[PDB]
Structure formats: C-alpha cells, structure tokens
Write a protein that binds this ligand. Structure first.
Ligand SMILES: [Mg+2]
Ligand SMILES: [Mg+2]
Ligand SMILES: [Mg+2]
Ligand SMILES: [Mg+2]
Ligand SMILES: [Mg+2]
Lengths: 48, 209, 138, 164, 129
RNA sequence: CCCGCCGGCCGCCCAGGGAAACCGGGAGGCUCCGGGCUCUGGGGGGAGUAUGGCCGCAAGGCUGAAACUUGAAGGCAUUG
RNA sequence: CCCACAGCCCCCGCCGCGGAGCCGAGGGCAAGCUGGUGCCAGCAGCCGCGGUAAUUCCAGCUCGGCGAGCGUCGCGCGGCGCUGCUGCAGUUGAAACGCCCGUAGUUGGCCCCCCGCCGCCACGAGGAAACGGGAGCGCUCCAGGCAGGCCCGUUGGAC
C-alpha cells in the first residue's frame, strides 16, 4: 500500500585496487598471463 | 578411408600432373571435390568464419517446421576468397554444409596500387562494383596506410581476401547480411574479368592442356 | 532528363529547391515558427513552474503532477521518474521541469507526457533519491 | 579589451566514431601495456599527429615531381622526420611516409629511449624515475615522460649529475 | 530533335562493341567527332575509320578491336581550373593509372595528362577507358 | 502469287533490367549512375477539412494550412 | 628571484598525508550469481520486462567503459543518395496535368583555320591585419609565443 513498499550484507573490507596505470597492468595479466570463460559460475566457484 | 577421386580432374590432382590452383582457374574448370583444394591448401593457411545464422519456418497443418540457414566465408589472406550457404534441420549440419559449399566455390582476387608503384600490391586493381538483391557496393582503391573504411561485415571479407587499403560505399538495404556479402563477393569475382591496357598483349595459344 | 540541366538554369533550380524543401516534416517544424509559438518552453532547455495537483498493454499506473509555468502562465503535465519520489513533492510547491528524450513527442507508454521533474525546492530529485541531500528545510 | 583574448588554443586529439569495438580495445590495451601509456588520450594524440603527416604527404604526392611547391614542402617534411627520428635516414622518397605507423612515434619517447639503453628495467620503472627527476638530456633535466628526443640527442642522454 | 551528335555516336559505338561487331556507321559527322576519334585511335582503342562525303552531314565508318570498355560525354561543358582536375579524375575514372579525359582548350583538344603537363585548364568534353 | 521498302496496330521472346509480378517498338543502352523541356512526391492520420481568394444561377470547381495524434501503414511474392 | 607593493612560477636548505568518481551488465552496445516484490511498486531514447528462477524493478557480490572528470535536457552539423548540381523517385509502394494551341522562359543539326566583340583558361597589378595554411626556433614537454646564442643573411619574423 505505502509507496516504496519494495524499498544488508557487511561490506567486504578489502585492499583497494590500484589506481592509474597499475590498474591497466592488472587486466593485461588477468586475461593473458593468468588463467581465465569470463564471468560464468564455474569461474566464480573456483575463486571461492 | 582413403580419398578416391570420382572425377577426371580429381584423378589428375591425385597425381602430380597439376601443380597449382591457377592452372585450374585459367581454364574455368569447375571444382566438385573438397580435396581438390585442401591438397593445394594443406597447411592452415586458410581460415573459416561464420557470418550469420538465421531461422526459417514453414507453416503446416499442425505447427511450424523450423530450420536454419548459415553463411560461411573462407580465405588465405592472399588473393583467395570463398562464400557459401547451407541449410539443415540441425545448426551444426547446416554449418558443415555451408563450409563445404564455401570451400567448393572460390575465386582469385586481383590487387593493384594507388598511384605510386612499390612493393607488393596492397589494394584492389581498380573500381569494382557488385550487385545482389537491392544492395550495391563500390570499392575504390585507397592510398597505403588508409586501412579499410567499411562496415564490420564487409571488412572481414576484405581482410580474408587479403586487401589492406580500400574505400567502400554501400547502397540499398544493407541490413540484409547475405545480400551484402554476395554483392561484395561478386564485385571481387569480377576483378579478373576486366580488360586493361597492360593486358592488351596478344599471346598465342598453347596446345598443351 | 526529369531535371533541368542547361548551363543557364541556376535560377530555376534554386526556386525548385526553395519550394520543395518545405515538404519535409522536420524542416517545417524547425523553420516554420508554429512549433516555436506552440511550445510551452519557448525554446528553452527547461522551465520553472508551480505544482497544483498530484495525479496518476502494460497496466501500470504512473505518478505525475500538474504544473503552471511562471514565465508563461500556461498549464502542462509532468512526470516524476524515480520510485517513491511522489512523497518528496507537495501540493503548491515550486519545481524545475525539463523535457524527455524526444523533443515534443511522448516517451514510452505514458499518454500525453513530454516533461520531466528534475529539481524540487532547489534540490536535485535524483540526489534526494540516493539520500545525498535532504529536505529537512521543507 | 584584454590582451589575453588574442591568445590561440586548440585540441590535440581525436576520439573514435565507433567506441565499442573488440579488436580496437584489445589492440589499445596491448599498446598501453607495451609502452606504459597512462590513458587512452596519448593514443589519440599519436593518431592525430600521424593523420596530419599523412594528409600533408598525400597533398604533396598528388602533384608533379618537378613542382616548386612540391619540392619545397617535401624537403621540409623529410628533414623534419629525419631530425625527429621517426623515419629512417636511408629513405628520401615521399612514398615511404604514407606507410608509417604510430609505433614509430611511440618508440622515440623518453621512456623508450632510456629503456633501450638498458638504463631502466622497464617502462614503468622508467616512468617512476622520470617523475622523480633522475634523468637528464644533454646538460638539462627533463621530467616529462612524453618528451621526444631527437636523433642527434640520443647519445647525449644520461643520468642527472645531481641525482642521488 | 537531334542536339548532341557526339553522344549518339558514342552510344552507337558502345552498343556495337558490346555484341562483338566489327564495323559501325555514324550518321552526322563533325570536327569534334573526328578529333575524339583521332585521340581514341592514338591511344589504341578503335583502329581506323573513314569519312564518306555525301554533301549533307557526311557519314563515317569505324573498325573496332574489342578494347573499348566505356565512352561518354558531359553535356553542359563545365570549366575545369588547371588545379581542379584530380577531383574529376577520381570521380570519373576507374583508376589514376589508366583512362583518359578529353578537354577543349585555347591550344586545342587534348588529354588531361597533356593539360596537366602544361598547367592549363579548359572545358570538359568526355572520357573513355 | 513471293521478294522487298515506308507508315500503323498486335503476339511470343535471347540478352539486359527489376523487390518481384513482369518489360524487352522498353519499364534496356544508368552507383561504369550527365541528350533537351515541362509537371508531380517526401511515414500514416487530422484533411482535400478550417480560414481567405477566383469562377459559377445553383450543385459545386481551382488554390489550400495549423494545432493535435500515431509506430507503423503499404507493394510483390511463399507455406498453410 | 620577480613584483609600482604584494602574490604565483622557478631555485636553495630543514621536516614530510599518496586521496576516484559517474554511468551500465537482454539486444542495438563492451560487461553474470544470490535475497526480496509479484502486470503492484517500478524500469524502459526503440524493441520490450514485471501476473512465483524476473538474465531488464529494488538490494549485496562480481564485472565493463571513460577517467579528474562522468551523466541528463535543448539547439546546429553529420548520419541522410530521407531535399539528390555531383546524386532520389513518378506501371503496381506517395507521386505524369483529360487533350490541343500558345507568350515569357529554357534548349536549338552541319558548314568558312586566321578580322572585331562576349563568355572561358593562364599570368599579372592593386587592395588590412587577426584567424587558417605554412619556413625556422628544445617556453623542461604541450596548449603557446616570435624568439637566441654568438664568430650572428644587415640574425629572423619568409610565402
Ligand atoms: Mg541518373
Ligand atoms: Mg524517397
Ligand atoms: Mg506525409
Ligand atoms: Mg493502390
Ligand atoms: Mg501509387
């Protein structure tokens, strides 16, 4: 009835990803040097 | 097991009598066996690509009968391009048929220079036009380093054919992929059929083959 | 052919183009002037008015409001985008209203709506939706 | 009015007409990794310069060889390219210019020239030292990574005398 | 009524060449036609021809050799500045290496290559390749 | 009687053209896109409507908008 | 040091805060797993989603683009050969006046080698710069500006 009727997990406090070029360097090794299927469940299953 | 030639040309290719594909093309001999090319193209020099897959339906008494039509191109990036289509109840079988048909039909591509001559040819010999359905294409030679100014679909065909500089214009309903690919294929096919002042030389015919 | 092509025919081609360029709908809309006089915004990116009434194949009631432009005094209808944003809008309140994506034509399944609310009481609606700003002054 | 109104200004790069293109993204990321580019504006700058050179070369090439203007402008352009090290010394015909590539522009950046001399371990290390003013060109120290060295100045690059 | 004789002549020539003939007859001869044919002959496209005098707009007979690919005219003879030829070459010709464009100048009818050589301009008549 | 020429009315038709039906005495010689002249059209409704002007005994004819609305309307062909 | 005086830049000493946001993840268009809600609330430029797994709403995780900037609204150019001179269409999709005569207008076969005039092509004189192009110069680079070292074209600011 009340509008916004449709409208909390603790935030994963982890070290920030590097900023600037260092971020660019991360993806370069992420897709080539490091073993990857980008975004499927099985990849996320492995990382846990 | 082993490939048994079913044609005179096939048997001749089985033997070493014919040594190059240009020796077949120069007499307009049709190709009916996929082995006639792979024996001339053993290494992975050529490359296959799937362009578009479309589903077609036929209304019947109880529901529709569905099928798939596929389009495939092949080329070595050295003056050779092919294009074919196939249809079947299964997607993979249609892809195989399209690949076989693309391999079967192939044509050489003539390449030339823009203004200055130096090194190997890099662009089409002259202006080439093609037609299919409502789609017309224009290929204009470009200077070295100009890249390929074309849509993503046509650019793939140009890259496979082995052309690095060219200006393109498309007219008609270009969103119909098969007709655009056919238009560019026909334009490329016409290349070795235009007479130029360099080819005016009068050569006497040879009785052999 | 079907077009004049003589060497001394520039005048005829000029007048032909002048007459025939008026048949395009967009060109007429842009360079005729009727649209300019009819458009409530009078060619502005957005305007300022006052709220006077909160009102409502997809079957989804939408929340909107009636506005009266200050500089022009005419009445229009505006739509409140976000979820639960109607509460931030009170009767007899000053708002800033802009247009939709399409200039003039209606957007989406909303019938006869061409304006959007973006600021209320001097605070961005989207900012209030994310709690960046607050309306405790009102 | 103020004299500052007569100062000139201009942009220095061009953005692609089609933003999302997988091969282009891959190539740009590849180049950024090899040459340690901070962002994608440097690639656009390089493309801009290359386009300018290519257009000049085209316009000159459209004319006859024995044209006074053609000789003048071709000589100027070739001298500039040779001095900047983009084009090789042995090439003197205008045709060779049109085949140039942005990699040639990149290879003359300060980071690259110090890395090829073995004075730095990597492009990233080179950038880090450059920002810390530890390098010198001739008798002067330059702290701009994008600084372009000239062929006659390649052998005069060293480590800053005052650098610790 | 009849206006452009050269257009009719060129259309007839191309029509005959299409179906692999060997001789064509053009009805209304004229000096411009003769110079056009002379240039075509000099560049090796149409072998020889003859003019038959009848005291009334002489006829002419040409012999083909299956080399001509396309011929045409530009009806409203525009003026070409000496430095505005490359645009027309790009627009009209298949390539910058082969093909010819005919201009009439104060120095006479000549190919565009010759005009570029002398750095002069003029009016455009036609083209062939 | 048959062999022709000019003019006219028709049928089938190779090339060629076209989205195709089909045209081929052109709807050919055209993205390889320039013989000359005149007229008309620019998504569907509102609407051949309103207001003005001319004509007519009248019925009506010629000329001819805008606001607003809408996401498709249409052509040729295939299977049921 | 500079400055009318003060800053700011730059140089010399001592001590020493390293801080990323805005949009999005069905297609056009690069980027995917849990919990709520249940044609309601809402998203959606267009197609469309939502009536119990919602790949599209609301949230968490993860991921993508640009980046000290990102997004929204209106206008102009482009896209658009959908205003078409280059370069549209007019049997059936929108569109050849019912037909003839006819002024203005537009367009008009072939022919004389050398004279005059008009158009045309080339060159030249004359006439503001700034902007634009362009020769040369290491403001640390750059946007910029017309400078600098010494033995300087009479150094140069050409065109
Ligand atoms: Mg045309
Ligand atoms: Mg149209
Ligand atoms: Mg309409
Ligand atoms: Mg009808
Ligand atoms: Mg109709």
């Amino acid at each position: 009835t009340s509008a916004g009727k449709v409208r909390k997990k603790e935030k994963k406090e982890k070290p920030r990803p590097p900023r600037g070029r260092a971020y660019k360097r991360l993806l370069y090794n992420k897709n080539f040097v490091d073993d990857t299927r980008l975004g499927p469940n099985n990849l996320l299953i492995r990382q846990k | 097991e082993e490939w048994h030639p079913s044609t005179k040309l096939g048997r001749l290719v089985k033997a070493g009598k014919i040594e190059s594909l240009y020796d077949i093309f120069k007499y307009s001999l049709p190709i009916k066996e996929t082995e006639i090319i792979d024996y001339f193209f053993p290494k992975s020099e050529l490359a296959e690509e799937v362009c578009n897959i479309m589903s077609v339906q036929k209304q019947t008494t109880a529901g529709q009968r569905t099928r798939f039509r596929a389009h495939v191109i092949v080329g070595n990036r050295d003056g050779f391009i092919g294009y074919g289509a196939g249809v079947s109840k299964e997607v993979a079988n249609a892809i195989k048929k399209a690949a076989k048909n693309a391999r079967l039909n192939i044509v050489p591509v003539r390449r030339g220079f823009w203004g200055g001559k130096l090194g190997d040819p890099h662009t089409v010999s002259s202006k080439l036009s093609g037609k299919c359905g409502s789609v017309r294409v224009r290929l204009i030679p470009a200077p070295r380093g100009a890249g390929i100014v074309a849509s993503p679909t046509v650019a793939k065909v140009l890259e496979f054919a082995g052309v690095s500089d060219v200006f393109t214009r498309q007219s008609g309903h270009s969103r119909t992929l098969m007709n655009s690919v056919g238009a560019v294929y026909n334009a490329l096919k016409s290349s070795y059929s235009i007479l130029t002042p360099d080819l005016w030389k009068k050569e006497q015919l040879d009785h052999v083959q | 052919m079907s077009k004049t092509s003589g060497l001394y025919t520039a005048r005829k081609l000029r007048t032909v183009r002048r007459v025939n360029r008026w048949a395009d709908k967009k060109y007429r809309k842009a360079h005729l002037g009727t649209w300019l006089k009819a458009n409530p915004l009078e060619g502005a990116c957005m305007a300022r008015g006052i709220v006077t009434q909160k009102i409502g194949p997809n079957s989804a009631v939408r929340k909107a409001v009636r506005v009266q432009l200050t500089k022009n005094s005419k009445k229009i209808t505006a739509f409140v985008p976000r979820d639960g944003s109607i509460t931030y809008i009170d009767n007899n309140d000053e708002v800033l209203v802009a247009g939709f994506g399409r200039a003039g034509r209606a957007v989406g399944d909303i019938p006869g709506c061409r304006f959007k609310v973006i600021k209320v009481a001097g605070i961005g609606l989207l900012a209030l939706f994310l709690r960046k700003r607050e309306k405790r002054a009102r | 009015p103020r004299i500052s109104r007569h100062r000139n200004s201009s942009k220095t790069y061009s953005t692609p007409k089609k933003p999302f293109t997988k091969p282009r993204l891959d190539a740009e990321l590849k180049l950024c990794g090899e040459y340690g580019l901070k962002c994608k504006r440097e690639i656009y700058r390089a493309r801009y310069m290359l386009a300018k050179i290519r257009r000049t070369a085209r316009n000159l090439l459209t004319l006859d060889e024995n044209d006074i203007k053609r000789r003048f402008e071709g000589a100027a352009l070739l001298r500039r390219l040779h001095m900047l090290g983009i084009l090789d010394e042995e090439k003197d015909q205008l045709d060779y210019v049109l085949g140039l590539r942005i990699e040639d522009i990149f290879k003359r950046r300060l980071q690259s020239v110090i890395v090829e001399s073995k004075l730095a371990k990597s492009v990233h290390h080179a950038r880090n030292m450059i920002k810390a003013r530890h390098i010198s060109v001739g008798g002067q120290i330059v702290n701009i990574p994008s600084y372009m060295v000239r062929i006659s100045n390649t052998s005069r690059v060293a480590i800053a005398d005052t650098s610790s | 009524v009849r206006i452009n004789v050269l257009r009719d002549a060129l259309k007839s020539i191309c029509n005959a060449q299409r179906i692999g003939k060997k001789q064509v007859i053009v009805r209304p001869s004229s000096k411009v036609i003769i110079e056009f044919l002379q240039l075509m002959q000099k560049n090796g496209y149409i072998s020889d021809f003859a003019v038959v005098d009848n005291h009334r707009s002489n006829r002419i007979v040409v012999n083909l050799i299956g080399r001509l690919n396309k011929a045409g005219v530009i009806s409203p003879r525009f003026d070409i500045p000496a430095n505005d030829i490359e645009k027309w070459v790009v627009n009209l010709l298949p390539s910058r290496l082969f093909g010819h464009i005919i201009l009439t100048t104060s120095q006479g009818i000549m190919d565009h290559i010759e005009a570029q050589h002398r750095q002069i301009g003029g009016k455009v008549i036609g083209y062939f390749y």
